[PDB]
Scaffold this active site. Structure first.
Site, PDB file in Angstrom:
ATOM      1  N   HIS A  43     -24.234  26.048 -28.214  1.00 32.28           N
ATOM      2  CA  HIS A  43     -24.754  26.824 -27.100  1.00 32.28           C
ATOM      3  C   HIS A  43     -24.282  28.264 -27.051  1.00 32.28           C
ATOM      4  CE1 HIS A  43     -21.262  26.280 -24.285  1.00 32.28           C
ATOM      5  NE2 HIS A  43     -21.637  27.490 -23.931  1.00 32.28           N
ATOM      6  N   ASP A  99     -22.811  19.596 -28.736  1.00 32.36           N
ATOM      7  CA  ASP A  99     -22.625  21.057 -28.680  1.00 32.36           C
ATOM      8  C   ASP A  99     -21.749  21.439 -29.867  1.00 32.36           C
ATOM      9  OD1 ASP A  99     -22.717  23.704 -27.625  1.00 32.36           O
ATOM     10  OD2 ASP A  99     -21.495  23.167 -25.836  1.00 32.36           O
ATOM     11  N   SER A 199     -15.963  28.669 -24.078  1.00 31.47           N
ATOM     12  CA  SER A 199     -16.611  27.874 -25.110  1.00 31.47           C
ATOM     13  C   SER A 199     -16.251  28.124 -26.562  1.00 31.47           C
ATOM     14  CB  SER A 199     -18.129  28.051 -25.009  1.00 31.47           C
ATOM     15  OG  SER A 199     -18.551  27.280 -23.918  1.00 31.47           O
TER      16      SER A 199
END
Ligand SMILES: N=C(N)NCCC[C@H](NC(=O)[C@@H]1CCCN1C(=O)[C@H](N)Cc1ccccc1)C(=O)CCl
Lengths: 251, 30, 79
Positions: A43, A99, A199
């Site tokens: 992502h 992810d 992230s």
């Protein structure tokens, strides 16, 4: 990272910075799994709902950095992506499942006191260490607060792993087998969490049987940050171990 | 690459403990 | 009913839950996405039929295009 502390120096050498070429802005974090490959959160690269689509060209990696700002001239390495690899069934249309993503660096990195790879869990490590209560540790240069505030230095926060069912009920989004959530419960009168900006940053655990550190997960998402009764979700790094190697010893 | 993986040179190798690495280890014995 | 999360629904379904149409198991870009994966050898990949070649805990899925995430689950009744 919310309710963290400044990283010591050389404490997490595997921590990477995924920087968008220009505007020169920080987009996510990542890990050095080898001297040629960086692992991150898909992502960070792809998320259509947000017209997010990077190609091995709008980004660049920064290795062995400590400070978010200063270009640490004889420490840090600015490397350039060669190729990207997003997990084929990385569900961005639902819960952000799988992810995971990989970046092949153009020219290999040279390990220094401040730049060294983390290990991938083997079934035995994964199996004995991925257990509710165990603490692992996050690292990122992401926002220090859910709102209102960017560190000047890498941060850390050790969060205990939570029981799937507690995680399960923690939210509305479909939690999968390729996810773990970790954080303090409301009564443990302790807090900490990775937040937006975090992230790709690694969720590592140190091993008792041998003392090596292991990427067990990747900062995927979560709701708000440090909210009470919510947990932060992480990619199950173990769980996508074959795709990881299928691609690497691939090309 | 990865063979000398997960051994920080300014810690594990100098034999130093990061200021909290311990919070993690005790977390399993207990 | 479909037992194991369609771990073997080998039917002639061909539409993602959204009424979108499964792209040929062997389209040449359904084969693309499909190669670094790890597919199980029981679950035979039939034309453009919904299958669960994975073991996807969720159920039977299929492709819907040629880019990552461009896939979808399929509507059967599990047990
Ligand atoms: N406290 C946390 N761990 N918060 C999450 C931080 C990680 C953060 N991830 C995100 O922002 C991802 C990408 C899109 C929505 N998202 C989120 O975390 C959403 N806020 C939750 C969500 C889940 C599933 C589908 C849609 C939305 C990142 O850096 C990318």
């Amino acid at each position: 990272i919310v309710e963290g502390s400044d990283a010591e120096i050389g404490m997490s050498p595997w921590q990477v910075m995924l920087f968008r070429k220009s505007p020169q802005e920080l987009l996510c974090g990542a890990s050095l799994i080898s001297d040629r490959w960086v692992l991150t959160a898909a992502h960070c690269l792809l998320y259509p709902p947000w017209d997010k689509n990077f190609t091995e060209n709008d980004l660049l990696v920064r290795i062995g950095k400590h400070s978010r700002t200063r270009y640490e001239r004889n420490i840090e390495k600015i490397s350039m992506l060669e190729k990207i690899y997003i997990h084929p069934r990385y569900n961005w249309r639902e819960n952000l499942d799988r992810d995971i993503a990989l970046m092949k660096l153009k020219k290999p990195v040279a390990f220094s006191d401040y730049i060294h790879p983390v290990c991938l869990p083997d079934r035995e490590t994964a199996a004995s260490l991925l257990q509710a209560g165990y603490k692992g540790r996050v690292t990122g240069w992401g926002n220090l607060k859910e709102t209102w505030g960017q560190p000047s230095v890498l941060q850390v926060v050790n969060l205990p792993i939570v029981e799937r069912p507690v995680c399960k009920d923690s939210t509305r989004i479909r939690i999968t087998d390729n996810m773990f959530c970790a954080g303090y419960k409301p009564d443990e009168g302790k807090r900490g969490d990775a937040c937006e900006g975090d992230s790709g940053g690694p969720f590592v655990m140190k091993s008792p049987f041998n003392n090596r550190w292991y990427q067990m997960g990747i900062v995927s998402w979560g709701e708000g940050c440090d909210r009470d009764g919510k947990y932060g979700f992480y990619t199950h790094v173990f769980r996508l171990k074959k795709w990881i190697q299928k691609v690497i010893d691939q090309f | 690459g990865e063979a000398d993986c997960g051994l920080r040179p300014l810690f594990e190798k100098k034999s130093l403990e990061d200021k909290t690495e311990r919070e993690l280890l005790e977390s399993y014995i207990d | 009913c479909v037992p194991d999360r369609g771990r073997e629904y080998r039917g002639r379904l061909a539409v993602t839950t959204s009424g979108s149409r499964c792209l040929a198991w062997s389209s040449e870009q359904a084969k693309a996405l499909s190669k670094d994966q790890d597919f199980n050898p029981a679950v035979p990949l039939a034309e453009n039929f919904c299958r669960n070649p994975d073991g996807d805990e969720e159920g039977a899925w299929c492709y819907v295009a040629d880019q990552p995430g461009d896939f979808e689950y399929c509507n059967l009744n599990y047990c």
